[PDB]
Subunit: 175 residues, 2 copies
């Protein structure tokens, strides 16, 4: 986290033993490990933000205790977040503005770093094991170049186009 | 600097032209000077033709210097409703709010001092056009005790020499015409 823009590639994980072998070998640093994460998705009037390709999430990470208010979009390559003190409080603030819980997504999540690359290891119940590879930038001009780098890095990680999942978590759940 | 908050804020505002009793009372009760003489910049955000204002809602990004207090505030609808959150990065939250449709509508600047006597927040304000004001407020998570907390505020105000004579119930935005 530090960058308005990002490219991300998301992948199904068939084998977590080999993933964790790449993480040791790449000398990734562990940010957070096996957190329970709860994402409250919020929207006005059924679908006001959904319709502009924006998602707004109130996210809590347990046991790390990270609390984030996140605006994703418009589209796939835009995302900004703020660290918040109190999820219940920001929720009520946004409710006053007319944003109400649309649905929730829960997951288990670990976050690793390899230089500028974030590796996120996800497990959802209704779906399975995922990895997400992402780089962020504040430079709008570099975004197109980050696409090639993110692809090259993922391949290095043994996570190739054949195992790619281009559907978001909210799409995979019909939300 | 972090400020600790609530859901409702019961508040009485007064125009003041000397602060003798108020100063004497702060000293006598050994008031906590939370921060004194801060420059405070309030960026009021709104959508479209003033959609928030049209709901009796104000939404503010507040910075205070030198304390470095940074707050995201939703005021209303109306009267006693007020919720606030410490934020780390004003430009970030401003950028996120813009993606939602909220954009700066106007700014209000003030000099502000903040004191605590127990649950009472004492605020002393100077605004360029308007003059000097003092507010006594209490916050609460209890909607049912509002009028009782009004009487408590009134009693306190009077002990501080702030008389009903001087009361200014209009908000700063209302006094400026914004």
């Amino acid at each position: 986290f530090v960058g308005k823009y990002e490219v991300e590639l998301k992948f199904r994980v068939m084998d977590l033993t080999t993933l964790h072998e790449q993480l040791v070998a790449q000398k990734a640093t562990a940010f957070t490990l096996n957190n329970h994460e709860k994402d409250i998705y919020l929207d006005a009037n059924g679908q006001d933000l959904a319709d502009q390709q924006i998602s707004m999430v109130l996210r809590e990470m347990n046991p790390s205790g990270i609390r984030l208010w996140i605006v994703k979009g418009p589209g796939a390559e835009r995302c900004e977040a703020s660290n918040i003190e109190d999820v219940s409080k920001v929720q009520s603030m946004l409710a006053t503005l007319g944003y109400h819980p649309a649905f929730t997504i829960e997951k288990q999540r670990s976050i690793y770093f390899v230089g500028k690359f974030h590796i996120t290891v996800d497990h959802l119940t209704g779906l399975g094991d995922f990895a997400e590879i992402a780089i962020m930038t504040d430079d709008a001009t570099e975004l197109d170049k980050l696409k090639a780098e993110c692809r090259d890095f993922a391949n290095t990680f043994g996570l190739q186009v054949d195992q790619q999942e281009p559907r978001s978590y909210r799409q995979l759940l019909g939300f």
